[PDB]
Amino acid sequence: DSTECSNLLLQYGSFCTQLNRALTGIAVEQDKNTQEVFAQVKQIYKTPP
Amino acid sequence: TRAGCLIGAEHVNNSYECDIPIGAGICASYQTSQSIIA
Numbered sequence A: 001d002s003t004e005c006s007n008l009l010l011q012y013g014s015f016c017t018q019l020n021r022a023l024t025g026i027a028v029e030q031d032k033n034t035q036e037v038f039a040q041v042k043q044i045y046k047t048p049p
Numbered sequence B: 001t002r003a004g005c006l007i008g009a010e011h012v013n014n015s016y017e018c019d020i021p022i023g024a025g026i027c028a029s030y031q032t033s034q035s036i037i038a
């Protein structure tokens, strides 16, 4: 909540941008992990009685 | 959605294989004029 933010951003928010890119890659990477471990076969057969 | 509120795309009831990971069971694609669908 600092009253100057644009100067702070243009001087040091690019490191945070790169690290946020790293976290976004990790997040999409975890989603792809869940997809490849649970969706090996994409066929839905209903449970028989 | 459970992930958040989405503005700017048209929701469709039918489902396809998705390439843009949104989250909370929702995905995005650009095919339908032509507009982004969720």
Ligand SMILES: *[C@@H]1O[C@H](CO)[C@@H](O)[C@H](O)[C@H]1NC(C)=O
Binding pocket: B013
């Ligand atoms: C999608 O489902 C909702 C469920 O209420 C319905 O109101 C809507 O008309 C449906 N749209 C299409 C294109 O089937």
